[PDB]
Amino acid sequence: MERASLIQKAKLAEQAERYEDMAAFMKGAVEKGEELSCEERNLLSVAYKNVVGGQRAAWRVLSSIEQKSPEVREYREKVETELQGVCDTVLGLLDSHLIKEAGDAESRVFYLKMKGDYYRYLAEVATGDDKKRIIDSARSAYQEAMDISKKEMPPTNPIRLGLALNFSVFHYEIANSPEEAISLAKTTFDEAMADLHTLSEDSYKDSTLIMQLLRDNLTLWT
């Protein structure tokens, strides 16, 4: 069908809270060849975030049941495999349709951050060596997104903050470096506050919510 309607069905999907359908529509809209607008971009991450979120939660529930004293493992693996399917789909979509397929610094950072997040999820369920490879491909994506944000965006831009937030989660929960996670989260927060004045009602609500998430993490981490 037409890109215009694909976009329309995703909005409907999100309304009816049918994220799997929503992610599929967006995927069809992406393969249409044309770049996505800011609005479209968010539809894409919201759809896939919800789909993958359910699987990640399922996985965590199961793996904990497995560790806490045959079926558990077999089922955890099924969920895990299904989760890796989605991540490879998102990553493929990014590598051959979205990443640097545009010009804007915001669109570029957004896509590279998304690449970091999905490699990060793949890292949550991987084991020895395969994990090291995945972890390193996650970091290079975050770092490249970080380099672009620090040169192209003010310290309060919500995308830059979302990126810095998730990159700190990466340091703490994946790269096993609590030290680095805490300082980046703290450094991102301060430089954010120090500019909050006249942050324009534009991205106010978003950056404000991410700033709170940064704090929650700092508290939980310390």
């Binding site: 979302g162 929960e173 981490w221």
Partner: peptide
């Protein structure tokens, strides 16, 4: 450690 927060959520 009760899972940290990421964005979007």
């Amino acid at each position: 450690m009760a899972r940290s927060h990421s964005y979007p959520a």
